[PDB]
Amino acid sequence: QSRSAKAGLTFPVGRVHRLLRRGNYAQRIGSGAPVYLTAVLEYLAAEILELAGNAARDNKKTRIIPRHLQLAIRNDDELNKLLGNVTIAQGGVLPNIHQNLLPKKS
Amino acid sequence: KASQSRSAKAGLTFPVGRVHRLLRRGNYAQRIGSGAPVYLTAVLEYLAAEILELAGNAARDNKKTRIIPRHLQLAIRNDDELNKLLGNVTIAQGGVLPNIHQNLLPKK
Amino acid sequence: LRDNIQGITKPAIRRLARRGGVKRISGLIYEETRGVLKVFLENVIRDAVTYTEHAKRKTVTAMDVVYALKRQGRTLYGFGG
Amino acid sequence: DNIQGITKPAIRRLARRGGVKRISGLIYEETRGVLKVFLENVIRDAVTYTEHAKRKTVTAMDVVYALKRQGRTLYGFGG
Amino acid sequence: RKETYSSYIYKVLKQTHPDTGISQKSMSILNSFVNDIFERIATEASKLAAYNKKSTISAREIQTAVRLILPGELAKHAVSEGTRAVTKYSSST
Amino acid sequence: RKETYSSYIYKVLKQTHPDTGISQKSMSILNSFVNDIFERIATEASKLAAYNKKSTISAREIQTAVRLILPGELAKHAVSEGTRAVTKYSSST
Amino acid sequence: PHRYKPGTVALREIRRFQKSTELLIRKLPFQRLVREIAQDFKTDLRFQSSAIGALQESVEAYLVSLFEDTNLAAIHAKRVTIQKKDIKLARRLRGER
Amino acid sequence: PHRYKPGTVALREIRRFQKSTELLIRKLPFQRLVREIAQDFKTDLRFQSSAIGALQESVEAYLVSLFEDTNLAAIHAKRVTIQKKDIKLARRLRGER
DNA sequence: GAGAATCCCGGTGCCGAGGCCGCTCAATTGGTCGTAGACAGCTCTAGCACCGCTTAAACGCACGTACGCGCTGTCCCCCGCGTTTTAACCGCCAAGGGGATTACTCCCTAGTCTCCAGGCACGTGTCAGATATATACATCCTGTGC
DNA sequence: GCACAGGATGTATATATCTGACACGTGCCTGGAGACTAGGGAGTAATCCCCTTGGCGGTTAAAACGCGGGGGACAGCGCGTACGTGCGTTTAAGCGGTGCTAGAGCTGTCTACGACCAATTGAGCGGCCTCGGCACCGGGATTCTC
C-alpha cells in the first residue's frame, strides 16, 4: 500500500523522499519530513490552481493559458510578494493605469 | 618517512586539510576530488592576500598600524571589483563613503 | 502606547540622513521614516525569532540574527564569528 | 547594421507595454545599450555552463539556471 | 525516461475543478514552480539543520523553515494542514 | 576548543606588510569574509555539479565556480594562481 | 479630412497591448543579436530553439519591469515623458551596478 | 557678530559625519523598541548585547543607503528638499513593500 | 450630429490536449544494528533590573531667509498618417553533426587505525600617551609721562 | 594723543615617573597525514538518431521616411513658507556598580529511529489513438470622439 494513501495525500511521498535522499542535504532524513513536505506542496498547489481556476471561470475559458496564470499569480499580493523575483513564460502584465495617465477631467 | 602536510607541498599557507574537512562534512557532494581542496585553498589565499594588500594600503594612507574596519570599508568600497563582489555586505564599524554630489556644492 | 517608536529621536533621523549626504529634510518625514524603521524591524526579527525558537532557546544570540540578515540578502560581518 | 537589429517600433512596443505615454527620442540607442549589457551577463553565465558540460550547444535548462543564479529566474523552459 | 507530476497535479485539479483543462506549457510553468519551491524549502532545511549542529533531517526544521520562507496566511494554513497530515500518517502507522 | 583562520591570515599580512597590526573586530570581518566566500563558491559548485549529474567535486567545476562568481580580472588571476598551485601539487616527484 | 487627437490612438494601443501578451521583439533579429554576441566567446556555438524564446521572454520581462519603473520615475518628476536620466535613475535605484 | 551662510556649515557636518565611524543613536531607546516590538512574537525573550549591536548596524546601514537613494531621487526631481513622495518613490524602486 | 473602432455572434476545420494498454524499474515490506539525538544534571556566564549622579543632548520658541511651487509664454521636438520597400515570416528538404546511450575498465577516492606535531590557549617582556618640574627667554599686557 | 618701562605669561624642552596596550615562550590535544583496502564512478569509445542550420522561394505585415501640427518641457519670476540657526530649559541615556539569578552549554547515558540489504508488485511513462475547444474569417450591433 502507498504511503501517500496512509498520509491521505496525492503527491508522491516516495518520489519526493527519493529526491530528498539524493538531495544531498544531510546524512539522515526522517520519515515524517517528506510527508510534511508533500502536505505543504499539496496545499500550495491547491491554492494556486484554485486561483487559476477562478481566473479561468471569470474569463469564460476552460483551458489554462499562462496569461491566466499571470493574472492568478499577480493579483494576490501575498503570492506577488513571494513570486516577486520570478517572471512567467508568456505571462503578460496586469492592466494598471495611474490616475492622471488617463487624460481630460470627469 | 617523516613528511609535512600537503599545504606546503602545494606551496600554500591556508590549511588545505581543514578546508578539505569542511568540504567532506559540508555535505556538498558525497565524493570530493584531490585537486578541489588545494584549488580552493589557493583561491581563498589569493582573495585574502588581495584584501590585505588593499587594507594595508588604506592603513598606510591613514599612516596607522592596526587595521581599523574603516580601513576595510575603504579598501572594499573604493575598489570597483570588490564593490561588485561585496555589494550587499555590511562591514561592522565600517561607516560610509566620502562623496558629495556636484549640485549640493555652492556653485554660485 | 509608550514613547518607543518615537523614542528614536527627531535629530537622529536627521543625523542618519546626514550620514548619507542630504541637505534639506522636511518635518513630516520623521514619523514616516520611523514607520520605515519599524517595518524593516519586524520582518528581520521574525526570522531572528524563528531561528531562536528552533534552537529551543528563549534568549536571542548574536548568530541567528546575522543569519537572519543573511536571509534576505542583507548579509553582515563582524558578529559572524 | 546587424547591431541595430532591434528596431524603433520594437522599443515602442516594449514602452507601451510598460504603459508610457510620451517617449523622448534619445531613449532608443541607450536602451539598445541596456540590452547589449543585460543579455551580455547571461550569455557569459550560460556559455560557461555549456563548456563545463563538455557541450558546444546551449539549451533551455542551463540558461534557466543562469537566470536563477542572477536572480530573475524563469519558468516553463525546464528547470 | 523522465519524471514529473502530471497525473498528481491533474488529480488535484480534477478534485477541485472537473471542467478546466491544462496546457502542457502551463503545466511546465507549474512543474518549474513546484520544484523551485521544493528546492528553496529543502535548501533552507539543509542550512538550518546544519546551523544547530544536527546531522539529521526531521519534521521540526522543515517546520521552522516553512514558517520562515512562507509568509502570513500561507504559513499558518500550511502548518495546520501539514500537522494534520503528519498526525494522520503517524496515527495510521 | 574554537575554530578560525586567525594564524593563517595573520601570516598572510605579515608576509607582505610586517609592520602592520590587526584588530580582532577586523579579524572577525576577515573570518566572516572567508567563510562567506567559501560557502558561496562551494554551494554554487555543488549546484553546478548537480546540473552535470556528477557526484564528484573535482577542480574543474570549482574553477568553473570561480569564473561564474568572481569578477573577471581577479577571476583570471585566481585561476592562474590556482593552476600553478595544482601543478605544483601534482609534481610529487 | 479627419485627424485624431494625440493621446487617443496611443492610449488605445496601450490598452490593446495590455490585454494581449504576445512577444514584441521580432524573433529573427533578436536571434541574430544573440548569435552575434555569443560568437565573441566561443565560435561555432549551436543554439537550441526554445533557448532563444527563453532569452526573448526574459528580455521583454526585464524591459517591461524597467519601463514601468522609469514611467514611475518620470511621473514623479511631474512629467509625462521619460528621459535617459530617468533611465539611469531607475537603474541606480534598482541597484543595477 | 559674524555669521556663516546657511548650507556652509551643513556641508561641514556632512563631512564630519562621513569622516566619523561611531553610531549615531542611543542604545536604550533601540533596546526598548526591540523589546516592545519583539514581545508580540514571543514573551520573556532575552537578548545578546552584540545581537542588539548587529540590529543597530544593519538598520543604520539600511537607513543610510535608503537616505542616499532618496537624496538621488529628490535631486532628480529638480529639488534638494526631500518629501513623502521621495520616500514612496525610493521604496517602490528598491522593490520592498 | 457622422465614423472608424471596438464587442459580439455564426460558420470552418484541425491539431494538440484527454483516454488506453504494456510493463519496467522503483515505491513499498521485513529484519539488523549502531549511533546520534532525547532527557537529566550541574555549573558558570552573563543578562536583567535598579540606585544614583552627569551631563551631552534633546525639546521648545522666536526669527528669517533660501527654496518649493503656481503660473506663463516659448519653442519645438515628438506624434498621426500615406507610401514604398524590405526584411521578417512560413513551408519544407536536407544532411550532417552533435547529444544520447550502453558497456567495460581502471583508478581514484571513501573508510579505518596509528601517531605526532600544528595549531591552538595561556602566562609574561616590550613600546606609546599622560602628568609633572623648572627655568631662562621671548613676547604680550599694562601703568605712566611729555 | 603717543612712546617708554615694568610685570605677567606662554613655553620649550630636557629628564623623571607612570600607566596602558602590544608580541613571544610552554602544555596539550586532536585532527591531518600515511598506509592499506575496496568498490563504484567517470573515462572512453562506438553507434544511433534527432535536430539544427542553412537554403531556397513566395508573400506580406511592417518599418523608414517625411509632412503637418500641437501639447509638453522649460526658463523665468513672484510669493510665501518652511526648515535652518540659535539659545534657554529640562532630561534621559549613560556609566558604573551591585545584586541576583536564570539559562547556555557541556557531559552522561540510554534507546529508538533510520541507514542498509534482500525481496516484491504496481503504477506512471510513453507510444498510439480520438475528438472537440477554440483561433480564425466574415457579418452585425455599439462607443467614444471631433
- Enumerate domains of chain F plus CATH numbers: 1-93 (1.10.20.10)
Q: Cα(E57)–Cα(E51) distance, rounded to whole angstroms?
A: 12
Closest CA to H34 of C64, C71, C38, C75: C38
For residue C68 the three cell numbers come to 537572519
Q: For residue G78, is it left (φ>0), alpha (ψ between -120 and 50) or beta?
A: left
**Which amino acid, H12?**
R
In contact, B28 and F42? CB cutoff 8 Å = yes
In contact, A22 and A15? CB cutoff 8 Å = no
Q: Cα(G17)–Cα(A28) distance, rounded to whole angstroms?
A: 53
Is F91 in a helix, a strand, or coil?
A: coil
Exposure of C23 by Cβ count < 10 A (0-12 exposed, 13-18 middle, 19+ buried)? buried
Q: Cα(D7)–Cα(D28) distance, rounded to whole angstroms?
A: 9
For residue B52 the three cell numbers come to 590585505
Chain H touched by B102 (CB under 8 Å): no
Domains of chain B from N-terminus onward: 4-89 (1.10.20.10)
Phi, psi of H82 (to 5 degrees): -105, 130
**Which amino acid, G76?**
H
* Resolution (Å units): 4.2
Min CA distance, A90 vs chain G (Å)?
7
Hey, which residues does D74 pair with through a beta bridge?
Answer: A87
Q: Cα(A98)–Cα(H85) distance, rounded to whole angstroms?
A: 15
Q: Cα(H33)–Cα(C35) distance, rounded to whole angstroms?
A: 12
**Which amino acid, F45?**
A
Report CA-CA distances (Å) from A33 to B2, B29, D41.
Answer: 49, 21, 38
What single-letter DSSP state applies at residue E92?
Answer: T
Domain total for chain D?
1
What single-letter DSSP state applies at residue C62?
Answer: S
In contact, D6 and D35? CB cutoff 8 Å = yes
For residue C41 the three cell numbers come to 524591524
What single-letter DSSP state applies at residue C28?
Answer: T
Cell numbers 505543504 correspond to A40
- The answer to whether the Cα torsion of C54, A47, D72, B88 is positive or negative is negative
Hey, which residues does H10 pair with through a beta bridge?
Answer: none
Q: Is the CB of H7 under 7 A from strand I?
A: yes
Q: Cα(A22)–Cα(E42) distance, rounded to whole angstroms?
A: 12
Phi, psi of C11 (to 5 degrees): -70, -10
In contact, F31 and F4? CB cutoff 8 Å = yes
Q: Cα(D66)–Cα(D42) distance, rounded to whole angstroms?
A: 6
The minimal CB distance from H17 to the residues C15, C37, C60 is found for C15
**Which amino acid, C27?**
G
Min CA distance, C13 vs chain E (Å)?
30
**Which amino acid, D58?**
V
Query: Which of chain A's residues 63-102 bind strand J, using a 7 Å CB cutoff?
Result: 63, 65
Chain G touched by B101 (CB under 8 Å): no
CB atoms within 10 A of CB E6: 13
For residue F13 the three cell numbers come to 599580512
Solving technique for this entry?
cryo-EM
Q: Can you spell out the DSSP letters for B45-106?
A: HHHHHHHHHHHHHHHHHTT-SEE-HHHHHHHHHTSHHHHHHTTT-B-TT--------TTTS-
For residue G50 the three cell numbers come to 526554445
In contact, A87 and A94? CB cutoff 8 Å = no
Domain hosting residue C53, numbered range: 1-81
CB atoms within 10 A of CB H40: 10
Closest CA to A6 of E58, E87, E78: E87
Q: Domain of C61: which CATH number?
A: 1.10.20.10
Torsion of CA A55, A61, A66, A68, to 10 degrees: -20
Which residues are within 8 A (CB) of B25 and not within 5 positions of it... i.e. 6 or more apart? none
Q: Cα(F43)–Cα(F45) distance, rounded to whole angstroms?
A: 5
The minimal CB distance from B66 to the residues F21, F33, F92 is found for F21
In contact, G34 and G52? CB cutoff 8 Å = yes
Q: Cα(B10)–Cα(B45) distance, rounded to whole angstroms?
A: 12
Phi, psi of C61 (to 5 degrees): -85, -175
Q: Is the CB of H18 under 7 A from strand I?
A: no
Phi, psi of F47 (to 5 degrees): -65, -40
Nucleotides of I under 7 A from a protein CB: 3-7, 16-18, 25-29, 36-38, 46-48, 57-59, 65-69, 77-81, 87-89, 98-100, 108-111, 117-121
Protein-to-nucleotide distance from the CA of E55 to the C1' of I115, whole angstroms: 29
Q: Cα(E44)–Cα(E62) distance, rounded to whole angstroms?
A: 8
In contact, A85 and D71? CB cutoff 8 Å = yes
Q: Can you spell out the DSSP letters for A56-103?
A: HHHTT-SEE-HHHHHHHHHHSHHHHHHTTT-B-TT--------TTTS-
Q: Is the CB of F52 under 7 A from strand I?
A: no
CB atoms within 10 A of CB G78: 8
- H-assigned helices in chain D: 8-18, 27-52, 60-69
Which residues are within 8 A (CB) of G63 and not within 5 positions of it... i.e. 6 or more apart? D14, D18, D31, D34, D35
Report CA-CA distances (Å) from D21 to A103, D24, F67.
Answer: 10, 10, 42
How many residues can be counted in chain B? Answer: 108
Chains near F (3 or more Cβ pairs under 8 Å): B, C, D
Helix, strand, coil: what percent of chain C each, to 5?
A: 55, 5, 35
What single-letter DSSP state applies at residue H81?
Answer: E
Exposure of A83 by Cβ count < 10 A (0-12 exposed, 13-18 middle, 19+ buried)? buried
CATH (one of 3.40.50.300, 1.10.20.10, 2.60.40.1730, 1.10.10.10) for G6-97 = 1.10.20.10
B to H contact (≥3 Cβ pairs closer than 8 Å): yes
Which residues are within 8 A (CB) of E84 and not within 5 positions of it... i.e. 6 or more apart? A39
Q: Cα(F51)–Cα(F33) distance, rounded to whole angstroms?
A: 27
Q: Cα(D31)–Cα(D13) distance, rounded to whole angstroms?
A: 13
Exposure of B38 by Cβ count < 10 A (0-12 exposed, 13-18 middle, 19+ buried)? buried
Q: Is the CB of A66 under 7 A from strand I?
A: no
In contact, D75 and E32? CB cutoff 8 Å = yes
For residue C52 the three cell numbers come to 531562536
Q: Cα(C1)–Cα(E87) distance, rounded to whole angstroms?
A: 42
Exposure of A58 by Cβ count < 10 A (0-12 exposed, 13-18 middle, 19+ buried)? exposed
Q: Cα(A64)–Cα(A70) distance, rounded to whole angstroms?
A: 11
Is C7 in a helix, a strand, or coil?
A: coil
Q: Cα(G14)–Cα(F15) distance, rounded to whole angstroms?
A: 65
In contact, B77 and F31? CB cutoff 8 Å = no
What angle in degrees, to the nearest 10, is found between the helix axes of C10-20 and H8-19?
A: 80
Closest CA to A37 of E26, E55, D75, E57: E57
At E34, which helix (H) or strand (E)? helix E24-51
